[PDB]
Write a protein that binds this ligand. Structure first.
Ligand SMILES: CC(C)Oc1ccc(C(=O)Nc2cccc3c(-c4ccc(CN)s4)ccnc23)cc1
Lengths: 238, 99, 38, 49, 289, 238, 238, 38
């Protein structure tokens, strides 16, 4: 049962043979906006399979000195495929996300990644009064690296980060993690270029180690937007 | 939420959230102990149960400690984890803690 | 005692004893068993 | 004992976690000693300017 | 599953187990679920009927107590020669200045509540003549309304702003402000930028802007100076809270951001949140007899 | 009827031919802790006849100059038999007690002992601001002697001590006293090494006298723990 | 099913993830002595969870030259915890036992331990007419070593020892063994200091071998007394 | 008059006229008679 999984969305599918169940954030599932919660009165476009499909980001190398990695949503996808085109042509966006994180190694490797989805991960800067600037936050498809993962770069606590939706990749146990994120905002829709609802954080709480011959151990991130809606059609900001 | 069990000098940042175990050549050796004081500073303080409880003065009820082994698939081993009710010193031998 | 015309003027509402801790403790799509979990 | 083959790492880690059970109860609210300030924060004055 | 919980759970008595294929003390943390092992499964238990209430940890009770949000002292005097709060001040309303309230609020991602506001005023003579029973005016100035420039400016005529007039001899002035966000909840944290250009403020949701509190002494100045201190207390009420967060560990640096430095050494250093012990085998407060 | 008594608990029995009825403290009888009052959730050990039996202490000599004697419970029994072993291996204890005090003399002797069980007999020191130390209080099996029985060593009153559960041994009338003590604590169980629920006090309000040839007139104390329960098994403090 | 096991008795629990079912000796389960088989007429003490819990002995190192190890019951437990205290204070004892033997190694190790519970394992001496002395038999908590495991140190046969209740730890297959022993005596109760009902024997019929880097491979023994009863209370022999 | 939400806020409860003085005056297991007591 819990160990094998197939995810199919649009023209894309993923199989894993070493899942550890999967997380639905706060027990919710993505849905479209109902009429009794709607604000914008124009008829939304709902592209379905053109947007609601897995996009794969660039892989990152797991190293002995890694501090961990982060990507902000929708920012990381705002330039990718038909999701990106709808983002650029529309004032308002709403979606959930399906996050699938991939990392495999041999039975002689050890290491543990915390895979945590943080809502409203407002970052702090270290050792300054000046707030983080636009280019510190808006990393896009490449994402960022943690400066001080021990405090989640926000004066807080890695140890208590399990309060957020999460899984672990413990290389002994499993080689993938899956989190389903609902829409998570104070408004029913948002401008996708100035606010990120979710941050995916991948942090190596136990470092990668082995005594076999070393290999590159990549971590790969695949994200499917779910139930995408767009409102306020205009020219592309792009 | 993770306990800061390795709250020792020369454990920095993330390193404080894990305990390293090695193969020994003597039987039944002690590996670590955990102070159970939530009021005094110790491995339990910066935890979700810890931080919320420190807004209060009185507490009751059971705790669970969960340990995840993060060695390789080929690693094997057995551990004994003991809770000692209060009254005396912390046990330093397995056949004392086993009681 | 509340003689004001706006309901937000009222005193605090300390009566909501509904909980669902499983949305934070058990957000797994297939529920745990009391039985090997994996 | 911890027993590992030559190609595994000779040293392994535990992560310990704690939670309360649902028989747990808290009582008598107080100011938490986890936070404090000796000064005004930066830009707290600027709110008056 | 959602249920009404008024007391902590009972314990049932349990017997010896020894069942093949049943391992309730084993778990898989990688799923992200918390351990479901019950005490009855870990040890032999007795029956306990548990009468401990849980009402003091209700979110309403945890947050709905009045905390200091603003504190301003100003000179009440003839100000013609001053360069200063000239018998009045303006405050841009925020919850980030006093850390005890800030840390409690920041346990959550979203909050919806009405704000009970209590205004406490105290006066001291400048370096004795007795203390004057002054009248104060507090005026709430929303976004886009004009703030007073002077103690006696015509903005204080308050045609449509809400004002409260209160004496120093009165009990503290008290009013409720409704939940006034343009969204369904306040954003306690905001991973976003306030404007359509790139230079807007990071970390503050424009949707949560309250406005300004303007407080003047209504009396003309006396022949001698006084120092007047105004304290503002806020109590959240009618609270909803969503998405609990890891608590703040490092000292706050600024009201504008989450920036962090840590203490110079543990506790609450950036390298070490918990204070050190000599080894993982050292028990610091060990009982010895 | 009221003059003869047999007490049987476990492998032990006592007969008296000169009782003066017996006292049940505040009209209670010992019982085990019910589930609706219980706190500790582990299953208690209830050793029954191994603990719930008479233990006899060392006798004390009644003399013309005697001020009276005291023993604290459970302290006096904490090192005796299987009661003592369970005390040493367990964090928590609860029991009642059966107290039987023995003293006989000839029909030519006179003397009266007040036999009183005092709950929470918190002692004072005489003529100092310093509180009594550990070794002033914790006398164990040997017990202590009254310094100033007239004020019960606590700034109070022997004369009003009849407010506590008591009997007299008036040598003319009777030669034994019996008091049954329930569990008497603010908590449902306690740590037996740091708190005493009960103090047995034996005070010679009328002194021993005769004109026959003198003999040693001993006072002997036999105590049975009743309904013993122990919780929180660990290694022995011992 | 048969591969994972949890044992819970008192405040103690053991989990194994590589069991090979478990043995109930002769198909019996431990029970208390019924009235129609009882001899001693005093009311027994039944301490339950204070005695009926796992005690863990000192581990032994498995070596290339090992002959095997033995422990006698109740002798090995007669000085441990509240079981030992009840043994020392009582003339008569009765119980069953739960035996759990633990030994793990890598997937590159080989070796097989016969784990056998022998009733009335009356030992012989080698090459003498003199019977084994008290100190040859009564090893206590430490146990003994086999001199000639091939004849079970009693002029008999390791090969036929499978007639007794047993399991194997074959390192390829499993890493623990479990045997449940009923009371096994010609009398309904016994004096625990002069007779052993059961001997646990652990014999390495296939020696430990590997070509990985060597590690200490310990064997650990955990024994729970079951349904303990004690009769004939007196002072402790101790 | 009690408008507070917590019941411990109320005024004093001076209505409990139950007595049992025999638990201090007559704690003998066999009750006295009105008749030689010994
Ligand atoms: C003059 C009188 C008639 O009206 C007033 C009006 C206002 C005040 C005053 O200080 N309120 C307040 C002080 C501090 C905070 C607030 C809040 C907040 C909710 C969430 C926040 C995060 N950003 S902030 C909302 C409304 N108010 C507040 C005092 C008097």
């Amino acid at each position: 049962s819990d160990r094998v999984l197939q995810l199919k969305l649009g023209n894309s599918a993923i199989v894993t043979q070493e899942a550890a169940n999967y997380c639905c954030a706060y027990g919710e599932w993505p849905n479209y906006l109902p009429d009794h919660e709607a604000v914008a009165i124009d008829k939304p476009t709902q592209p379905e399979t053109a947007t609601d499909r897995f996009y794969t980001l660039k892989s990152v190398k797991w190293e002995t000195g890694s501090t961990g990695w982060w990507w902000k949503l929708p920012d990381a996808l705002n330039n990718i495929g038909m999701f990106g085109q709808n983002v650029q042509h529309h004032y308002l966006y709403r979606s959930g996300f399906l996050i699938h994180v991939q990392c495999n190694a041999t039975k002689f490797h050890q290491g543990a990644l915390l895979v945590v989805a943080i809502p409203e991960h407002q970052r702090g800067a270290h050792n300054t009064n000046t707030s983080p600037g636009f280019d510190d936050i808006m990393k896009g498809e490449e994402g960022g690296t943690f400066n001080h993962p021990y405090v989640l770069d926000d004066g807080t606590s890695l140890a208590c980060a399990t309060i957020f939706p999460h899984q672990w990749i413990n290389l002994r146990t499993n080689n993938s993690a899956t989190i389903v994120l609902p829409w998570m905002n104070a408004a029913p829709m948002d401008f996708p270029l100035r606010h990120n609802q979710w941050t995916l954080a991948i942090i190596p709480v136990v470092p990668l180690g082995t005594r076999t011959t070393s290999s590159m151990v990549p971590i790969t991130v695949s994200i499917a937007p779910m139930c995408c809606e767009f409102n306020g059609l205009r020219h592309a900001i792009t | 939420s993770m306990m800061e069990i390795n709250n020792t000098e020369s454990a920095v940042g993330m390193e404080r959230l894990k305990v390293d175990i090695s193969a020994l050549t003597d039987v039944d050796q002690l590996l670590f102990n955990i102070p159970l004081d939530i009021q005094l500073d110790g491995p339990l303080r910066n935890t979700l149960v810890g931080n919320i409880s420190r807004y209060y003065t009185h507490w009751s009820g059971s705790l669970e400690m969960t340990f995840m082994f993060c060695g390789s698939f080929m690693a094997a081993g057995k551990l004994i984890l003991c809770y000692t009710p209060p009254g005396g010193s912390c046990p330093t031998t397995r056949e004392t803690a086993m009681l | 005692i509340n003689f004001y015309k706006d309901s937000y003027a009222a005193s605090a509402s300390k009566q909501d004893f509904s909980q669902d801790p499983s949305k934070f403790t058990e957000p797994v799509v297939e529920g745990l068993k009391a039985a090997p979990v994996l | 004992n911890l027993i590992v083959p030559s190609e595994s790492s000779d040293t392994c880690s535990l992560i310990g976690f704690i939670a309360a059970k649902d028989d747990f109860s808290l009582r008598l609210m107080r100011d938490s000693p986890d936070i404090g300030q000796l000064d005004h924060l930066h830009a707290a004055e600027a709110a008056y300017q | 599953i959602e249920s009404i919980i008024k007391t902590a759970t009972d314990t049932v008595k349990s017997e010896i187990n020894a069942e093949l294929g049943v391992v309730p003390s084993l778990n898989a943390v990688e799923t992200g679920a918390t351990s479901n092992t019950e005490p009855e499964e870990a040890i032999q238990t007795r029956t306990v009927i548990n009468q401990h209430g849980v009402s003091e940890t209700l979110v309403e009770n945890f947050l709905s107590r009045a905390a200091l949000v603003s504190k301003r002292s100003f000179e009440y005097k003839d100000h013609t020669s001053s360069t200063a709060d000239k018998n009045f001040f303006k405050w841009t309303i925020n919850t980030r200045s006093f850390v005890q309230l800030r840390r409690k609020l920041e346990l959550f991602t979203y909050l919806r509540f009405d704000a009970e506001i209590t205004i406490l005023t105290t006066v001291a003579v400048n370096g004795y003549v007795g203390l004057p029973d002054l009248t104060l005016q507090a005026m709430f100035v929303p976004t886009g309304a004009l703030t007073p420039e002077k103690q006696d400016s015509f903005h204080w005529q308050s045609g449509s702003n809400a004002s409260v007039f209160f004496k120093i001899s009165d009990p503290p002035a008290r009013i409720t402000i409704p939940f006034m966000c343009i969204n369904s909840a306040y954003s306690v944290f905001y991973d976003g930028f306030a404007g359509f250009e790139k230079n807007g403020l990071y970390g503050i949701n424009p949707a949560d802007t309250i406005g300004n509190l303007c407080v003047r002494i209504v009396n003309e100045h006396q022949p001698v100076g006084f120092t007047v201190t105004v304290r503002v207390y806020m109590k959240p009420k009618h609270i909803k809270a969503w998405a609990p967060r890891p608590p703040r560990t490092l000292p706050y640096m600024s009201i504008a951001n989450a920036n962090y430095k840590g203490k110079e050494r543990a506790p609450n250093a950036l390298s070490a949140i918990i204070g050190n012990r000599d080894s993982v085998k050292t028990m610091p407060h060990n009982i010895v007899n």
